[PDB]
């Protein structure tokens, strides 16, 4: 579950922190919020390798472009470079991204699908929990949201995904990008799914395990004298 919500003076993106291998939860605290540029962040869904690889590649080329032009990077640049790359690979790079940021042009919120289609909105959601999240956004979104209201709406939309989607879970990560301010990255903004104490300590008595052999491993280089 990834959402983006436009507010008065900026844009806010949120995401859950679960990655899956089939029906198994591989990472209970994944990081789906990526820094393309200091003030351009995007949330990714789909193939985990593809979303990291595609944001890092465009993030690198955006940095070189920014140095070349002596200008702070624009969201439309990151957006254009991402969609032309994804279109080239005809959806085989399974990157579904919500691209947000503030630049000299203002605040922007975009979504980009794996086949290279982009769209513009005040509120977007992508991933398996998009329908759960979009249900909350369609119920509670209004024009002229404050910063505090937009964070609340964004995190509530992620929670909708966490509870009601088996693909989404664990914590809520938020990133607020306000015009004329430093982007604040709120890692684990909410912790609604903290595991309870176990009934028993499964710490074993020492010597429980049967050992065939023991040896020192040499990690040091070839020594002197």
């Amino acid at each position: 579950t990834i959402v983006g919500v436009k507010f008065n003076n900026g844009v806010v993106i949120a995401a859950d922190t679960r990655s899956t291998q089939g029906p198994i939860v591989a990472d209970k605290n994944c990081a789906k919020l990526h820094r393309i540029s200091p003030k351009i962040w995007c949330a990714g869904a789909g193939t985990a390798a593809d979303t990291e690889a595609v944001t890092q590649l465009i993030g690198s080329n955006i940095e070189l472009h920014s140095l070349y032009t002596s200008r702070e990077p624009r969201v439309v640049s990151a957006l254009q470079m991402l969609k032309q790359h994804l279109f080239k690979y005809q959806g085989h790079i399974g990157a579904y991204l919500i691209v947000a940021g503030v630049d000299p042009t203002g605040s922007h919120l975009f979504s980009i699908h794996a086949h290279g289609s982009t769209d513009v909105g005040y509120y977007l959601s992508l991933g398996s929990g998009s329908l759960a999240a979009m249900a909350v956004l369609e119920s509670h979104w209004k024009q002229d949201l404050t910063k505090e209201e937009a964070i609340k709406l964004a995190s509530d939309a992620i929670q909708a995904g966490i509870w009601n989607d088996l693909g989404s879970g664990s914590n809520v990560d938020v990133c607020v990008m306000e015009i004329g301010k430093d982007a604040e990255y709120l890692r684990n903004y909410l912790t609604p799914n903290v595991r309870e104490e176990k009934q028993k300590s499964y710490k074993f008595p020492r010597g429980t395990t049967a050992v065939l052999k023991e040896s020192i491993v040499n990690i040091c280089d070839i020594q002197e004298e």
Binding site: D16, Q21, A26, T47, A48, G129, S168
Partner: peptide
């Protein structure tokens, strides 16, 4: 497998 929200 791959890791896949």
């Amino acid at each position: 497998x791959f890791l896949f929200x």
